[PDB]
mmCIF file of C-alpha atoms in Angstrom:
data_model
loop_
_atom_site.group_PDB
_atom_site.id
_atom_site.type_symbol
_atom_site.label_atom_id
_atom_site.label_comp_id
_atom_site.label_asym_id
_atom_site.label_seq_id
_atom_site.Cartn_x
_atom_site.Cartn_y
_atom_site.Cartn_z
ATOM 1 C CA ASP A 1 19.123 8.394 -30.584
ATOM 2 C CA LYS A 2 21.461 8.894 -27.692
ATOM 3 C CA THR A 3 19.359 11.933 -26.478
ATOM 4 C CA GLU A 4 15.916 10.236 -27.650
ATOM 5 C CA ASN A 5 16.698 7.530 -25.138
ATOM 6 C CA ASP A 6 17.242 10.119 -22.534
ATOM 7 C CA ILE A 7 13.939 11.800 -23.189
ATOM 8 C CA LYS A 8 12.115 8.635 -22.748
ATOM 9 C CA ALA A 9 13.700 8.003 -19.329
ATOM 10 C CA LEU A 10 13.119 11.580 -18.284
ATOM 11 C CA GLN A 11 9.479 11.878 -19.069
ATOM 12 C CA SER A 12 9.047 8.670 -17.041
ATOM 13 C CA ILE A 13 9.470 8.438 -13.303
ATOM 14 C CA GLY A 14 11.366 6.183 -10.906
ATOM 15 C CA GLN A 15 9.889 3.189 -9.155
ATOM 16 C CA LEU A 16 10.081 2.470 -5.522
ATOM 17 C CA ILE A 17 10.905 -1.042 -4.579
ATOM 18 C CA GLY A 18 8.938 -3.205 -1.942
ATOM 19 C CA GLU A 19 8.543 -6.914 -1.340
ATOM 20 C CA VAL A 20 5.293 -8.902 -0.754
ATOM 21 C CA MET A 21 5.242 -9.319 2.902
ATOM 22 C CA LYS A 22 1.781 -10.948 3.113
ATOM 23 C CA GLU A 23 -1.244 -11.380 0.661
ATOM 24 C CA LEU A 24 -4.382 -9.740 1.959
ATOM 25 C CA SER A 25 -7.065 -9.951 -0.764
ATOM 26 C CA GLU A 26 -7.259 -10.378 -4.506
ATOM 27 C CA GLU A 27 -6.397 -6.913 -5.447
ATOM 28 C CA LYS A 28 -4.921 -5.749 -2.220
ATOM 29 C CA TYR A 29 -1.291 -6.680 -1.169
ATOM 30 C CA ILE A 30 0.583 -5.940 1.983
ATOM 31 C CA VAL A 31 4.198 -4.949 1.287
ATOM 32 C CA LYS A 32 6.985 -3.965 3.555
ATOM 33 C CA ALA A 33 9.038 -1.275 1.549
ATOM 34 C CA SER A 34 12.843 -1.405 1.262
ATOM 35 C CA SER A 35 12.658 2.158 2.771
ATOM 36 C CA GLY A 36 10.520 0.765 5.593
ATOM 37 C CA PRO A 37 7.014 1.477 6.428
ATOM 38 C CA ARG A 38 4.323 -1.016 5.380
ATOM 39 C CA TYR A 39 1.512 -0.165 2.920
ATOM 40 C CA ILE A 40 -1.469 -1.539 1.258
ATOM 41 C CA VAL A 41 -1.057 -1.199 -2.453
ATOM 42 C CA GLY A 42 -2.858 -2.301 -5.523
ATOM 43 C CA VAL A 43 -2.147 -4.238 -8.723
ATOM 44 C CA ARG A 44 -2.452 -3.615 -12.364
ATOM 45 C CA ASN A 45 -3.461 -6.332 -14.712
ATOM 46 C CA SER A 46 0.085 -6.273 -15.690
ATOM 47 C CA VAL A 47 0.977 -8.926 -12.928
ATOM 48 C CA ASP A 48 -0.624 -12.289 -12.068
ATOM 49 C CA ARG A 49 -1.529 -13.792 -8.695
ATOM 50 C CA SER A 50 0.220 -17.010 -9.768
ATOM 51 C CA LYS A 51 3.149 -15.005 -10.663
ATOM 52 C CA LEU A 52 3.509 -13.547 -6.979
ATOM 53 C CA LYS A 53 5.026 -15.174 -3.960
ATOM 54 C CA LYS A 54 6.440 -13.698 -0.865
ATOM 55 C CA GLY A 55 9.794 -12.215 -0.636
ATOM 56 C CA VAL A 56 9.651 -11.449 -4.345
ATOM 57 C CA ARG A 57 10.562 -7.894 -5.032
ATOM 58 C CA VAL A 58 7.717 -5.781 -6.565
ATOM 59 C CA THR A 59 7.685 -2.407 -8.230
ATOM 60 C CA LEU A 60 5.420 0.355 -6.904
ATOM 61 C CA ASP A 61 4.715 3.759 -8.430
ATOM 62 C CA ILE A 62 5.682 6.818 -6.610
ATOM 63 C CA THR A 63 2.597 8.697 -7.625
ATOM 64 C CA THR A 64 -0.122 6.007 -7.207
ATOM 65 C CA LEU A 65 1.601 3.189 -5.521
ATOM 66 C CA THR A 66 0.564 0.236 -7.706
ATOM 67 C CA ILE A 67 2.403 -2.885 -8.756
ATOM 68 C CA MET A 68 3.121 -2.946 -12.513
ATOM 69 C CA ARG A 69 5.864 -5.767 -12.701
ATOM 70 C CA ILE A 70 7.851 -8.433 -11.012
ATOM 71 C CA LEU A 71 11.351 -7.270 -9.816
ATOM 72 C CA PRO A 72 14.413 -9.543 -9.314
ATOM 73 C CA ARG A 73 15.856 -9.819 -5.735
ATOM 74 C CA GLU A 74 18.338 -7.342 -4.299
ATOM 75 C CA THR A 75 21.898 -7.995 -2.862
ATOM 76 C CA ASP A 76 24.044 -5.698 -0.959
ATOM 77 C CA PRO A 77 26.266 -3.267 -2.530
ATOM 78 C CA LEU A 78 28.743 -4.418 0.113
ATOM 79 C CA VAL A 79 28.863 -8.126 -0.945
ATOM 80 C CA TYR A 80 29.760 -7.200 -4.419
ATOM 81 C CA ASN A 81 33.011 -5.808 -3.199
ATOM 82 C CA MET A 82 33.962 -9.099 -1.795
ATOM 83 C CA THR A 83 33.579 -10.983 -5.223
ATOM 84 C CA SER A 84 36.149 -8.462 -6.589
ATOM 85 C CA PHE A 85 38.799 -9.767 -4.253
ATOM 86 C CA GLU A 86 40.367 -12.856 -5.783
ATOM 87 C CA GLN A 87 44.101 -11.665 -5.748
ATOM 88 C CA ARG B 1 -36.381 5.776 -3.512
ATOM 89 C CA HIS B 2 -34.372 8.901 -4.156
ATOM 90 C CA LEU B 3 -32.743 8.587 -0.784
ATOM 91 C CA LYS B 4 -31.862 4.840 -1.230
ATOM 92 C CA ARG B 5 -30.200 5.656 -4.570
ATOM 93 C CA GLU B 6 -28.105 8.497 -2.875
ATOM 94 C CA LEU B 7 -27.010 6.083 -0.197
ATOM 95 C CA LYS B 8 -25.572 3.545 -2.614
ATOM 96 C CA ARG B 9 -23.725 6.619 -4.069
ATOM 97 C CA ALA B 10 -22.819 7.980 -0.638
ATOM 98 C CA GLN B 11 -21.129 4.747 0.226
ATOM 99 C CA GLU B 12 -19.492 4.507 -3.213
ATOM 100 C CA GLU B 13 -17.759 7.836 -2.497
ATOM 101 C CA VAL B 14 -16.086 6.527 0.537
ATOM 102 C CA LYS B 15 -15.134 3.290 -0.885
ATOM 103 C CA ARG B 16 -12.983 5.161 -3.204
ATOM 104 C CA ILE B 17 -11.179 6.302 -0.105
ATOM 105 C CA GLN B 18 -11.227 2.823 1.337
ATOM 106 C CA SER B 19 -9.249 1.209 -1.425
ATOM 107 C CA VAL B 20 -5.516 1.925 -1.834
ATOM 108 C CA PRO B 21 -3.262 3.919 -1.608
ATOM 109 C CA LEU B 22 -3.061 3.181 2.101
ATOM 110 C CA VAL B 23 -0.652 3.168 4.870
ATOM 111 C CA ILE B 24 -0.682 0.577 7.764
ATOM 112 C CA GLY B 25 -1.144 1.603 11.469
ATOM 113 C CA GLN B 26 -1.770 -0.201 14.695
ATOM 114 C CA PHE B 27 -4.630 0.415 17.082
ATOM 115 C CA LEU B 28 -3.639 1.247 20.504
ATOM 116 C CA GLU B 29 -6.759 2.135 22.467
ATOM 117 C CA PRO B 30 -10.049 4.042 21.847
ATOM 118 C CA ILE B 31 -10.744 7.358 23.160
ATOM 119 C CA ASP B 32 -14.416 7.285 22.525
ATOM 120 C CA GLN B 33 -16.056 4.875 20.009
ATOM 121 C CA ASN B 34 -16.115 7.446 17.229
ATOM 122 C CA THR B 35 -12.527 8.620 17.968
ATOM 123 C CA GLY B 36 -9.587 6.295 18.327
ATOM 124 C CA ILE B 37 -5.776 6.411 18.757
ATOM 125 C CA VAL B 38 -3.372 4.943 16.422
ATOM 126 C CA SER B 39 0.328 4.989 15.957
ATOM 127 C CA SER B 40 1.197 4.930 12.198
ATOM 128 C CA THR B 41 4.158 3.047 11.096
ATOM 129 C CA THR B 42 5.984 6.262 10.337
ATOM 130 C CA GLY B 43 6.023 6.364 14.292
ATOM 131 C CA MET B 44 3.601 9.223 14.620
ATOM 132 C CA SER B 45 0.450 9.272 16.537
ATOM 133 C CA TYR B 46 -2.838 10.447 15.185
ATOM 134 C CA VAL B 47 -6.148 10.769 16.734
ATOM 135 C CA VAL B 48 -8.502 9.495 14.039
ATOM 136 C CA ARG B 49 -12.117 9.012 13.116
ATOM 137 C CA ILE B 50 -13.455 5.632 13.577
ATOM 138 C CA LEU B 51 -15.306 4.980 10.345
ATOM 139 C CA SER B 52 -18.813 3.310 10.797
ATOM 140 C CA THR B 53 -19.825 -0.046 9.559
ATOM 141 C CA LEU B 54 -16.594 -1.508 10.902
ATOM 142 C CA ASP B 55 -15.393 -3.944 13.599
ATOM 143 C CA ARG B 56 -15.494 -2.599 17.097
ATOM 144 C CA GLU B 57 -14.900 -5.841 19.113
ATOM 145 C CA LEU B 58 -11.658 -6.941 17.513
ATOM 146 C CA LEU B 59 -10.821 -3.318 17.018
ATOM 147 C CA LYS B 60 -10.848 -2.294 20.601
ATOM 148 C CA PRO B 61 -8.136 -4.746 21.598
ATOM 149 C CA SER B 62 -4.777 -4.102 19.953
ATOM 150 C CA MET B 63 -4.907 -5.043 16.244
ATOM 151 C CA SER B 64 -3.750 -3.964 12.809
ATOM 152 C CA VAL B 65 -5.856 -1.420 11.053
ATOM 153 C CA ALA B 66 -5.923 0.411 7.731
ATOM 154 C CA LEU B 67 -5.495 4.176 7.502
ATOM 155 C CA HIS B 68 -5.606 6.581 4.626
ATOM 156 C CA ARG B 69 -2.474 8.212 3.526
ATOM 157 C CA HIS B 70 -3.655 11.619 2.379
ATOM 158 C CA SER B 71 -6.589 12.037 4.742
#
């Protein structure tokens, strides 16, 4: 099972994060990526319109660029080092 | 009647291209009215076809514009 779980991750692919910059139309969303350049991208029926608001991180695929799911916010690798000072 | 059925199909073709995946550019200025200039948001400049059956009166002043990513 330790290697079966690795198979399942391996035959999958990564996601590339964006956030909803501006709603354009029903099935078209404008995002500004965390890597930069803005796109227009689509949605599956794996997400709702009432479940998206702006500044909410969204997944995209790196082979079709379509949102499948809602993603929690991000927060610096740097600011986690500050919470580890308490001594 | 045949030619009208092939038009509905002709446009259907191009609509597949119209929908996503896309990248977002910015229109600078025309160079004809069938060719225009855009700077993509990868910071690269392309001379591009102006698709027909689009705006040409808010397009010619500077305004956002959608471009295809593989074409």
